[PDB]
Paper text:
During macromolecular X-ray crystallography experiments, protein crystals held at 100 K have been widely reported to exhibit reproducible bond scission events at doses on the order of several MGy. OH-cleavage from tyrosine residues is regularly cited as amongst the most available damage pathways in protein crystals at 100 K, despite a lack of widespread reports of this phenomenon in protein crystal radiation damage studies. A systematic investigation performed on a range of protein crystal damage series deposited in the Protein Data Bank has established that Tyr –OH electron density loss is not generally a dominant damage pathway in protein crystals at 100 K. Full Tyr aromatic ring displacement is here proposed to account for instances of observable Tyr –OH electron density loss, with the original myrosinase data shown to be consistent with such a damage model. To better characterize the reproducibility of Tyr –OH group electron density loss in irradiated protein crystals, we have performed a systematic investigation on a wide range of structures at 100 K. A subset of previously conducted MX radiation damage investigations have included deposition of readily accessible coordinate and structure factor information in the Protein Data Bank (PDB), providing an ideal database of protein damage series.
Regardless of the feasibility of a radiation-induced Tyr –OH damage event within crystalline protein at 100 K, Tyr –OH density loss is in general significantly lower than for Glu and Asp carboxyl­ates for doses >1 MGy, at which de­carboxyl­ation events were reported. Prominent Tyr –OH density loss did not appear to be a widespread feature of general protein structures, a finding that is consistent with the high energetic barrier for Tyr phenolic C—O bond scission.
Author numbering: 20 to 120, 124 to 464
Write the structure that this text describes.
Amino acid sequence: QNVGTQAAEEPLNLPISVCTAPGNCQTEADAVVLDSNWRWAHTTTGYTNCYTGNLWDTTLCPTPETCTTNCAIDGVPLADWSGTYGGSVTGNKFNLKFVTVSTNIGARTFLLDSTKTRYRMFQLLNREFTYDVDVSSLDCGLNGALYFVSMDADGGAAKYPTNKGGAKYGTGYCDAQCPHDVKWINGLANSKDWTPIPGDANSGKGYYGNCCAELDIWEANKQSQAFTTHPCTPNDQTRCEGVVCGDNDSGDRYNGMCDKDGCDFASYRMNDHTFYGPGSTFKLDSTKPFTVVSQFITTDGTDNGDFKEFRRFYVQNGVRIENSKVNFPGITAYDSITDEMCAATKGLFGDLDDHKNKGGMKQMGEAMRKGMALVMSIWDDHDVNMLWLDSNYPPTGNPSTPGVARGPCPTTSGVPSEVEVTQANAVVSFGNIKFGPIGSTV
């Protein structure tokens, strides 16, 4: 995309901590940038929309190349962050409102480095990543997500010279779902064969998808939470078409370059329904804030080893809370993501181990070694109504069959039109982000 001249781009300042030992950290003066999908797209030498509602203008965008020549994405000024997009920062806390009323629904954002010209790339192997979260106002159907993806640090600017904005304009998004709803891919409008998504007034799908590796630290609302590894072959940003995208709609979910299911550790799905929930007698009380700690263990305990284990623990009101465990007869009580856990649990659930097909923890680790961009988002789910996270999936499945039940939400929950009314004022908060060696962040 070209860059427009109507509004300066002003990312929100967000300090994080880089740590060397427990309680010995230094501030890193980073910032938050809005994903290019949420930006106004208009004519390069005017005010005329190139995209309105869920459609590209066919006169301006008869082809992707012409669209890209004629159109530009514009900046987010400071005033518009809260007023238009529902984003705000107080000290080291970042807040994202779900619906902001001209009416904005959801948000996806990235962490910029201290220069505000590149994404802050995190080399996560043999490191610990930690943050405080509040998901108390997110119920069934919503997801306040924090995760990493194998985006380029410059959003693709060096690879795709028609991308003028780079990381500064939140470009280059890709993930392990190979999404077609990304409006700008490889420096070009994804306007070919663009199709609105029914019941989604703001979104559509273009000819291409954009694939890359994804490490989900946090997919969650107050009812259920998960962390998940998604390797791809290769891991780096890859525009896809046809079978390579692994499109759900053509029966290709397991035929593409990315592991779409991922290998998940989701406490409720692993059959501990009392670990996490909205109340003081759950082990971890989702009505109150808490700290989420993630440790990425290698084979030799060094930065050069292969990724072998994703460990997790929590801190809430000064109380250390170890992760829940897998709880099925004849299955080891795993409390972390490893290749063995993935094989054993997917075996039990009858899920295809595409994680293993894509190179497993080792391949996931190669993405983490090269460095990944931090994503913070809030969203509802127009495909599957978040049932995969917090309900029975498939909805018609027996909840006593291992793998089906992922949370207590009813199978009628999560319809975007309903959650966008009922949960309009939901806000996820991510704060006090800390990064360092294992054992350094609490």
